[PDB]
Design a protein around this ligand. Structure first.
Ligand SMILES: CC(=O)N[C@@H]1[C@@H](O)[C@@H](O)[C@@H](CO)O[C@@H]1O
Ligand SMILES: CC(=O)N[C@@H]1[C@@H](O)[C@@H](O)[C@@H](CO)O[C@@H]1O
Ligand SMILES: [Mg+2]
Ligand SMILES: [Mg+2]
Ligand SMILES: [Mg+2]
Lengths: 735, 744
């Protein structure tokens, strides 16, 4: 137990650095005979360069607000809705060539002969248009303040501190400056052992409004990656010209939730080739200087595509990433083609958690736990923290917390040999993106699930630390090669008309044939939210695989058809670990079920059984026939159901916020749907708040407490014997 | 006080009949005595009650297109059971009419019709064998079925557990033989019925969609539905006349069966036009024969009423003397009351005199008065001529509290009529409900089964129930009306309500720029647009705009296309004209004030209240509504979405309401929305009740107003008159008070 830990550094704290490095077994130190990390920012920190070449800043297509015409002319302000300190209209590149004015009421592009850019203000004058339509402008804008340095400035209130102007290496002058500068920096940095690229060339979509608030964000977004030259080169390489609409996307800005369009994939391929070649050059230069190249998974990471084939050819030594939860841990941990991986764990060493009176040991251990369950399934090589080491030195409780965490992290390695725990089922998440977005489904802002996303993000968070093997596949994979014979369960989840359910791909009969035949043969299909949904295709069928999962969503087209709900089965394998208050169940049992009534169907429980948090409701789901097993169908609709389908099974879940109870529910769903109930017992914890990781090649299993509470649990082993555990706060026991 | 009241009666009950007729001031008696001199009603059932005829001509029963279950093929052949999902006592596949000409097998997975060469109907079994199909697709048959049990007679049989009695077989006058039988039989009946004064046709020729399943439960219902109206000959004649052949699909409609909630298709309107021409011709003949015999013809608004179209032009040319209908609530009262083209209208009130309500230990007087209150508030806005009850008088006679309640109700019904002269109260605003159907479905939007709103519909039906007794003039207009002629210059407020992709919101009509132009210009000019649920919604048309008029009402629905755009909610304004009568809960309000609003957070927007204010029942949620900009006024935006908002739009205003179950409080909320959105706040006070549990009806031409208590509790209220003076009332349980007003 020595190493695998990264210490942050600071001002005149050499004494205490030596002491905390030795107590924590740190083998590396990061900058604000150890391994020395220095962050590198290829597209900023050189205002002396970019102010003399201001047409080489990165650029972005922006969509104005919708302006109502009240006659045959309308004026459209360009900048009223954007942060003028970050963004500026590009007046250099011919607006009639590079911009588009759109009648949003008809979807038609307004002829360029019908609009002008005012000479003295940032306003477009549209003429010859229709009264009472809404108009917008899609315009090129220079990004004049690095989005992340800007976010840090605002967040920390840096006041009048000079704003860092970002620059785009797509232009040869800037590219040469960047590489010459890095060449010299390498020479000037003989003490640096690891170049921590934070990050590379293109920032994820991060645009601010006129009130200095975030306006548009997408951790995967490609908005901030255009220029007149790139657009013209793209047309030459791909053989058609992109519209501004191909970037602003009606105001959606190509959110990862949108069903991906050819133009998006083409643009990703275009940037990717460019970014990767230049990242490889940086890595090679780093290597020729005797240093390792480490990439931060975030910020300017667009075009790297860590999960696409070829990432290995970059020769990056490492990826480091932000550890917020199990899902975000897996995003880092599962990346192929680097030598090692690193988590930057919480809390960051900065006053918002390190104030007098606070116990930062608690955050520190929660973060360890959320990530630990995922680390057992997919180990990360190294751990470390960032920020002010002197701030964290004040809190002796937390210093102790770290000694414990670093020791445990290292003991896992020493015991495990960096081997993943054994997975008990092979589960595949099917969506439009597949492997290229492994652990990335449902994210908008990194680590920040919200009202609209948490009912689906919980599926990944549950899976992140679960005792099963998770893979990510696309509709393209399935249509080209069928379903791999080693897969036990397919999960399709999300709202209608997204990348995550799949949109009109579900009207492709080859897809439906493939999934139906595989389930009939013994496969297992789990649909969450609006799985397999296709609007309008069939008047009487919204979820195209409703026959598989036993459930459809009423869309107000079939109200004339009475819906008959079979009685709910409250005692079932899937819900076996759900506690239900006896008085709640009694009330449910006593109130009974609706009697058939004209135009209202029948059989819906008059009171809810309850007991399970399913998150956001999917309104008016109903069972397709009375042979479907309803497990929860409260409030006149369906939350949880299972259906036999030849030799296989379908399961419907309306939504699934992460909690230990809901992860147990999903785990049971996975064993049940795959007809593997008999396989569930081996290497399981009786208590849902604990989890078991089995390591057979090492003849070993561990059990973890995912809470800060004492946990009592009984572990059932393969041979059928049981073991009682009484685990302390965040405990771990090995047998 | 006597008259305008129809009493039911029965055999061996002349004395109780005479007494109650006198007590209730009844002027009519309903068969189910003759010496009393009352107007005698007799029910007539044109299309049933003659098994002796139809058993001899069974191919003249009415028919329906039925859709089977979806059957999964697991190879290139598949067998489809025709009858496994239907009630075999009610429905029989039609084997007489060439199935290859009249039926369709459909691959539901692709939408494709299977070549009729690839399928055969089993000679011995009600099963279709299909070959040359794709494995792993679902297949269905759409087939013609004879209806061998009258749906309503069957409903009554099952409901009343008649077990044994013979099933009445219905018949279809589209066939000349049956048509002659029906007319000759009526000619005969009239001769045999010299005592009858009013023929109560219950009803005419075509039963509303009412189909049962193999478990003897309702399977499919639509009070407006045309399912039970087809025949080989009618389908073939339609093709000749309209120049195109209807597919079985134009009826089964993918399993929707042409629900009134579906955006109407041309094929539906053509079929209604076709049926209605034939039904109306024959109803006119029945009415003419009645009139020639010295009798009146009265039509029940219900059961076999398909093709009559009481709200379509030409209804008056039938010469029907009356329409009678079931009083279920205010909305169903207005369905009857607003019918033009008859001499008088009648309500049959609740409870029905039957053992399900008249049983020992039950108090049917409470239901009787509740039913009267719900209808009375609507009757003030649109009078009906008569009331009455149905069923077994001998049952009602055993409940003296009930009998006395009826005496009170009859006297009050007549007093209202005498005081107002049968004239509607003054309406204080002109409100138009806009949907795909318009006038022909007046008071009929949101209905599936008559008077039975459910989880899926009540959030919208409550709009009509609120309006049904409200002090405003309500009309129903269609998108065709607006596109053809603009918005009538007298309209103050347009309401558009319902879920996306329905007749009630309108579907893709909202992608027609002429409609959007017309409504926007009108609101900008001082109009008022109230959108409920998913108003003006059109899916997929614009990635960043779902409600096409989101700019007018200030609210849109997030459809998971725009999650990258941070949503910023302005602070909620809890004190506002619209919400002025919502009861204040200080535990809720202080909890909401203290908890404050979300701070901006990446990918999560900001400004949403962390705790809900509450206080208003908006029914079914519309998930993820948000304000389009921070100049919209949020009135309720609890739980990270929007329930209630107003937006200024030039001279006019838009208002968004996520849903509106009926209650006194919500009817007041809607009423205040109408006055506010139309910039008519200072018109609000004249002829109003401070207390929302009461309502006011002003009759300028009679120099009167009244105030009514819509509850069974005492209610104190202050009425405000036009001259700004007020009067205080202490109204008893279900009461009414009349006062003088300046005569005009
Ligand atoms: C992993 C990653 O990209 N982290 C970034 C962080 O560096 C900062 O840019 C922030 C702005 O809201 O967005 C993310 O959290
Ligand atoms: C008004 C009207 O048509 N009433 C009918 C009633 O007569 C009966 O047919 C019932 C069957 O569910 O459906 C409706 O309530
Ligand atoms: Mg704005
Ligand atoms: Mg070209
Ligand atoms: Mg007027």
């Amino acid at each position: 137990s020595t190493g695998r830990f990264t210490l942050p550094s600071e001002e005149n704290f050499a004494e205490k650095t030596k002491e905390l490095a030795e107590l924590w077994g740190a083998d590396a130190i990061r900058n604000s005979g150890k391994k020395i990390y220095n962050a590198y920012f290829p597209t900023r920190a050189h205002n002396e360069w970019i102010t003399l070449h201001m047409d080489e800043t990165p650029q972005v297509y922006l969509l104005t607000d919708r302006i109502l015409a009240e006659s045959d002319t309308v004026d459209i302000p360009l900048m009223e809705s954007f942060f003028a300190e970050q963004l500026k209209p590009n007046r250099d590149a011919d607006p009639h060539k590079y911009w588009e004015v759109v009648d949003r009421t008809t979807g038609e592009v307004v002829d360029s002969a019908n609009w002008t850019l005012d000479a003295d203000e940032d306003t477009v004058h549209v003429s010859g248009v229709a009264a009472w339509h809404e108009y917008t402008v899609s315009f090129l804008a220079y990004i004049i303040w690095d989005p992340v340095e800007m976010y840090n400035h605002l967040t920390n209130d840096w006041g009048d501190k000079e704003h860092e102007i970002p620059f785009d290496i797509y232009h040869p002058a800037t590219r040469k400056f960047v590489f010459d500068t890095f060449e010299q920096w390498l020479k000037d940095s003989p003490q640096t052992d690891v170049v921590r690229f934070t990050t590379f060339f293109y920032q994820f979509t991060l645009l601010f409004d006129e009130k200095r608030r975030e306006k548009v964000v997408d951790w995967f977004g490609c908005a901030c990656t255009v220029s007149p030259r790139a657009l013209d080169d793209f047309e030459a390489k791909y053989g058609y010209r992109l519209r501004p609409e191909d970037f602003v996307d009606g105001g959606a800005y190509n959110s990862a939730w949108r069903v991906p369009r050819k133009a998006q994939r083409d643009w990703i391929d275009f940037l990717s080739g460019f970014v990767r070649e230049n990242v490889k050059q940086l890595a090679d230069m780093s290597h020729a200087a005797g240093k390792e190249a480490m990439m931060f998974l975030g910020d300017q990471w667009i075009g790297t595509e860590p999960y696409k084939d070829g990432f290995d050819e970059l020769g990056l030594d490492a990826v480091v990433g932000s550890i917020g939860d199990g899902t975000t841990t897996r995003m880092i941990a599962d990346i192929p083609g680097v030598k090692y991986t690193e988590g930057r764990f919480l809390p960051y060493f900065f006053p918002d958690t390190f104030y007098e009176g606070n116990d930062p040991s608690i955050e520190g251990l929660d973060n360890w736990r959320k990530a630990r369950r995922a680390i057992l399934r997919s180990p990360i090589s190294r751990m470390g923290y960032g920020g002010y080491l002197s701030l964290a030195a004040k809190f002796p409780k937390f210093v102790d917390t770290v000694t414990h965490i670093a020791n445990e992290f290292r003991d896992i390695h020493d015991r495990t040999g960096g081997v993943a725990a054994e997975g008990e089922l092979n589960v595949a998440i099917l969506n439009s993106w597949g492997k290229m977005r492994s652990w990335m489904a449902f994210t908008v802002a990194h680590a920040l699930p919200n009202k609209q996303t948490y009912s689906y993000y919980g599926i990944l968070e549950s899976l992140s630390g679960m005792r099963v093997n998770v893979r990510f596949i696309s509709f393209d994979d399935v249509l080209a090669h069928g379903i791999d014979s080693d897969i036990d369960v397919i999960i399709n989840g999300g709202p209608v008309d997204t990348a995550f359910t799949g949109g009109d791909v579900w009207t492709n009969p080859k897809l439906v044939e493939t999934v139906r035949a595989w389930v009939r043969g013994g496969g297992a299909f789990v649909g969450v939210g609006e799985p397999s949904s296709a609007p309008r295709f069939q008047t009487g069928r919204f979820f195209q695989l409703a026959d598989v999962i036993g459930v459809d969503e009423e869309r107000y087209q079939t109200l004339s058809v009475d819906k008959y709900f079979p009685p709910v089965v409250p005692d079932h394998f899937i819900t076996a670990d759900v506690p239900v208050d006896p008085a709640a169940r009694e009330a449910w049992e006593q109130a009974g079920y609706r009697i058939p009534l004209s135009g209202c169907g029948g059989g819906q429980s008059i009171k809810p059984l309850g007991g399970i948090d399913f998150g956001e409701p999917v309104l008016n789901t109903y069972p397709v026939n009375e042979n479907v097993t309803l497990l929860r169908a409260d409030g006149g609709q369906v939350q949880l159901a299972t259906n036999d389908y030849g030799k296989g099974r379908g399961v419907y879940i309306s939504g699934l916020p992460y909690s230990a109870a809901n992860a147990r529910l999903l785990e049971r769903v996975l064993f049940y749907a795959s007809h593997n109930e008999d396989k569930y017992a081996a290497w399981s914890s009786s208590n849902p708040e604990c989890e078991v990781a089995h390591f057979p090649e090492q003849g070993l299993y561990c059990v973890i407490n995912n809470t800060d509470q004492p946990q009592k649990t009984t572990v059932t082993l393969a041979d059928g014997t049981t073991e009682d555990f009484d685990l302390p706060d965040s405990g771990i026991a090995w047998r």
